[PDB]
């Protein structure tokens, strides 16, 4: 029913959880997004057992499946019909996503042009 | 009509003293208390069967509340029965001490 990608390998993620910041559960003033703990006694920086893990490059994902959505495609942000015309070749490897600022009539036009141009659209129903 | 599976017990996870590895399970099968008796069970399928709230689809039947985590016995763990098994998802820790079925599937006898 939908538009299939060219190939669809099994995407393997080394880690699905996020890397939360140390003591961000203990405070509200500490936001969840990651800061590297510098601090002379700090036990997650020292990598003690059973602690918060720190991100490193060994968690990096396979470059064949990097940035790939859970249905075989890679996203491209589109604002209008000309930017859809640039996506004609990719087709089986790149899908479009209409930006959040595009109004109702213009995204109607974009979804119609993508339908006749066989480009996959991630958010086709956004003002209806 | 009749049981057709051997009864084992989830004894715990594979572990040292202060580190546990939840991808391997330790199983105590009833009746076997040496390695050269564990040799029979060495590739058999095994199942943790349990019930929950919602209904799940049953192969060849109508939906009910039973759920199964499948696995298989991989090798022996130490001198007195006690095999170690590998399940598709790691077993929940509320299953420790409970019943696990060893299913006589793929057969070599």
């Amino acid at each position: 029913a939908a538009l299939r990608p060219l190939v669809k390998p099994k995407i393997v993620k080394k880690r699905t959880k996020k890397f939360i910041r140390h003591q961000s559960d203990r405070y509200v003033k500490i936001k969840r997004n990651w800061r590297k703990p510098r601090g002379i006694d700090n036990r997650v920086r020292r990598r003690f057992k059973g602690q918060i893990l720190m991100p490193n490059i060994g968690y990096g994902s396979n470059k064949k499946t990097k940035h790939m959505l859970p249905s075989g495609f890679r996203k491209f942000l589109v604002h209008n019909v000309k930017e859809l015309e640039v996506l004609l070749m990719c087709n089986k490897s790149y899908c479009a996503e209409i930006a959040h600022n595009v109004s109702s009539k213009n995204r109607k036009a974009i979804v119609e042009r993508a339908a006749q141009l066989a480009i996959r659209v991630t958010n086709p129903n956004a003002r209806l | 009509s009749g049981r057709l599976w051997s009864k084992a017990i989830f004894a715990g996870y594979k572990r040292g003293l202060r580190n546990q590895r939840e991808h391997t399970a330790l199983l105590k099968i009833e009746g076997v208390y040496a390695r050269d008796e564990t040799e029979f069970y060495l590739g058999k399928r095994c199942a943790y069967v349990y019930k929950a709230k919602n209904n799940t689809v049953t192969p060849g039947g109508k939906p009910n509340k039973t759920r199964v985590i499948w696995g298989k016995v991989t090798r022996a763990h130490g001198n007195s029965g006690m095999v170690r098994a590998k399940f598709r998802s790691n077993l929940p820790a509320k299953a420790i001490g409970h019943r696990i079925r060893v299913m006589l599937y793929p057969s070599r006898i």
Partner: protein
């Protein structure tokens, strides 16, 4: 077109050496020194249209996809399943009594006929004993016991193959949308050829089963585990 002239003793290794095989093939005398269509022409269909039309076959694609896939590499193993070597465990010889473990006929005791050409075992319960017809069953999912029925000189019909046993489909002819339902074909019909094949093979197996004592009661019964016996100690 001769036979192999070099019998194997361990696979990959012939028994006779290179010079011995030269001598056995007698290559000392038979040394040898030296030595569509794509287009057709259909007729004219004139007049004033003269010249027979040269027409090619397998024309160019009228469409090319916007990106293609590169072809694989070559792997040299990897034969399809129809060409695999079918192996059988040594304890299952024709006439052995097996125990079906997994199907709707869980824990049942049947006899073993020929093994089919796809590795699957053709068994029958003598259907008037335990309601098991001629079926296929997997070698990994039977347990082989040690009781025998000598089934030499039992006529097996040649039309008893995997194509004979392969499932049948009817859904769906010519219809794309479904709101009405097809309430037929869920009743799997036992065909008359299946019934008469069952009648023939049971009529030539069952008097041999009535010969040995207690075997028909044994085959009527089912296999089970109780509070005592453990399968690693059971002798089958």
């Amino acid at each position: 077109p001769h036979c192999s002239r070099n019998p194997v003793l361990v696979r990959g290794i012939g028994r006779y050496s290179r010079s011995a095989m030269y001598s056995r093939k007698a290559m000392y005398k038979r040394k040898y020194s030296a030595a569509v269509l794509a287009t057709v022409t259909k007729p004219v269909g004139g007049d004033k249209n003269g010249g027979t039309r040269v027409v090619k076959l397998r024309k160019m694609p009228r469409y090319y996809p916007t990106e293609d896939v590169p072809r694989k590499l070559l792997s040299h193993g990897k034969k399809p399943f129809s060409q695999h070597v079918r192996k059988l465990r040594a304890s299952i010889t024709p006439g052995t009594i097996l125990i079906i473990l997994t199907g709707r006929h869980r824990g049942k005791r049947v006899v073993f006929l020929k093994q089919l050409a796809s590795g699957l075992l053709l068994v029958t319960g003598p259907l008037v004993l335990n309601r098991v017809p001629l079926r296929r069953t997997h070698q990994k999912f039977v347990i082989a016991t040690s009781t025998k029925i000598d089934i030499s000189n039992v006529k097996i019909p040649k039309h008893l193959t995997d194509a004979y046993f392969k499932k049948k489909k009817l859904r769906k002819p010519r219809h794309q949308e479904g709101e009405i339902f097809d309430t037929e074909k869920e009743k799997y019909e036992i065909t008359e050829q299946r019934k008469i094949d069952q009648k023939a093979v049971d009529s030539q197996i069952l008097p041999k089963i009535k010969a040995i004592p207690q075997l028909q009661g044994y085959l009527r019964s089912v296999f089970a585990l109780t509070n005592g016996i453990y399968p690693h100690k059971l002798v089958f």
